[model samples]
Target: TSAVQQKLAALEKSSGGRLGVALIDTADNTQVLYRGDERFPMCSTSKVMAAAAVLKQSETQKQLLNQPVEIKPADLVNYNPIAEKHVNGTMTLAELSAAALQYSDNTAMNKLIAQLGGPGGVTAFARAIGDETFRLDRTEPTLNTAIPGDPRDTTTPRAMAQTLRQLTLGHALGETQRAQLVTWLKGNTTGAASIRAGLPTSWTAGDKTGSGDYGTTNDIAVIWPQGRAPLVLVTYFTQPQQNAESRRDVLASAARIIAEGL
Candidate 1:
């Protein structure tokens, strides 16, 4: 059997669905395997687009990413332990980017998105880079008890993959923007066990994942060393509760199986 087919079949035994995957192994020069590429609902992976948009704007204004900026109380976007710790305090743009991608800090994302010109701006920037499936809204929707999107942002697997590829290749925002984007992704402190699982420390896996009260879980990451081909992983699962680790494990198993083949 083909490596992808065999791995996917194994994943189905554990995860209970047609798990979607898109992988590019720069090591062997391959676009190894995939199932659905178009219809996945992205949670925090959308932040990559927001990050790109922010860098693009920063480039235009010739601003240094690490330059310090005061966080006015109004700039805070979400109420969480992490947000409470740093959202209303002073931070550099680099710091915000790290908090946004690494921490999945909603406040950091919200503030950066606003600075980058809002959901429309992020969407526009994503589309400019050949990510046609990305969409953004200004309001978070109430589906079930959780808010799944920014009312300002949403994406599919295809666009997300495109975003990761461009950012890695330094083609999306040019050298400066790409460099700044990677800086934060490399330090992503959130989503520790999902996309970040099943990889060796020698391999720096930079990724982002999102969850909400509405039963949404999604992750997008780049597996590095160039041997693993630095792929973009995205997933969406709605289960009984947001705190269910099993759901995240299912998604991770799917990604791990696919990464193994790649």
Candidate 2:
């Protein structure tokens, strides 16, 4: 743990970015963290929270995921491709959830956020799962603004890890719901260059990604080494240098270091 922690400290220094990590090796209770308590923009990764809320709605109200949801041209966010096609049409709740979590489709996310009763609903689900640090103050596009040092739409690595483990392996959701969420995460189209790049080809992994202004880049993942218990890793990186876009390899390296430590 000490060596892994030191390595990450050096990595942060060299990158000139603030990096926060929270890792849980569920097999033997091993844990590691680097600046895990500091607030960082949640970015599109907050899509995961929306997905969970959707699943919760599905659980409490059966057959909810199959219902058609309306999407109007007037309701689109600036960054939705999948949803633009469906303007003035409808998709299932499940379909929009997939588009949001797997594709980071902003239009789908905004619709889902409203479906679950707005950003307040997302935060309510977080609190229900015992998370106090995850907050979604606005809809997408706006949420991704990521003003430097703003607490709005921010989550600490520790809060991220805590909520993540519960959603993935704890009692926050049923086994079937957990499996569904994992499938969508594994189907993620936007994370290929980040933590996914650091993993072995044979290892199974899925992630949620967020990129914001001020060089904030983040990914939270569940990784399975063949024949072992899965580990949940949350990585958040932000450059102190303003407007300097973050590199995906930074997260890749963090994942590499973490797996090597294991």
Candidate 3:
């Protein structure tokens, strides 16, 4: 078996439920995939795609980013303790996107979804880009109760890897818009205990994280090891160990292993 497969096999032996990982070398389009095609709950990670769709639309829709949006009490989500503290407010579309992507704020995500014409628009953008496995069918709070077969935002590890690659290659949004997205991801503080925690000190990483019910933890990132080409890595853990620390360690280990192999 290849080195990537060997490491994944060892992880599988110690893991519970489904675990999917994808590592992409953007320099030459090389990849290593484990359960690459299997669907997994995206949770907050879906915010990344949502932000992309809105940003892309903004290029064609004048003044969209500057438009102010009201965040009503109805927009608040109980699942997001951070956003819950601020139950209502107003912000521009750009500010809303930042809240969603950088903080994984469910309220901000719902607002973005509504602005993008609902979940269909987000999924349509992904489908148009040849990422057919991604789906955004339910909003947050509701997604918390959604089962595997329910209409929730979902995607495969490989599909997310492709999404990250497309973003890096400038295939999805305009340069300025893509740059903003990267900045928002890099500002992400939610996944400090995940892939970023596992990377070498010299490397800097930008990522979006998704944590759901039933021991699910997911992270997708653009990793830049100093002096090397950037890479995209996606890690999804479903029904993993009940402890958050255990799940985090698994994700970090996966990232460290991939970096080592590369």
Tell how far residue 177 is off in model 1, in angstroms. 2.4
lDDT rank order: 2, 3, 1
> Candidate 3: deviation at residue 137, Å?
1.0
Off by over 4 Å in 2: none
Off by over 4 Å in 3: 79-88, 144-151, 240-246
Judged by whole-model lDDT over C-alpha atoms, candidate 3 comes out at 0.81
In terms of lDDT, the poorest run of 10 residues in model 2 is: 239-248
Error of 2 at 252 (Å): 0.4
Against the reference, the lDDT scores of all candidates come to 0.62, 0.88, 0.81
Residues 1-262 of candidate 1: C-alpha lDDT, one tens digit per residue: 5776577667655654334455655455455444445354465676777777777777767755766666666655544335566544667776767776877766667767667666777777777878777776652222113333333344555556656877766477779677767777777777667766655556677777776553456677777744534555555553444454335675677666765655
lDDT of 2 by residue, 52-112 (tens): 9899888877888998988887878777878888988998989999999988889899878
Q: What is the TM-score of each candidate against the true structure?
A: 0.79, 0.96, 0.92
**How far out, in Å, is residue 103 in model 1?**
1.0
Candidate 3 residue-wise lDDT, 51-95, digit = tens: 988889888876898888876677777645445655565678888
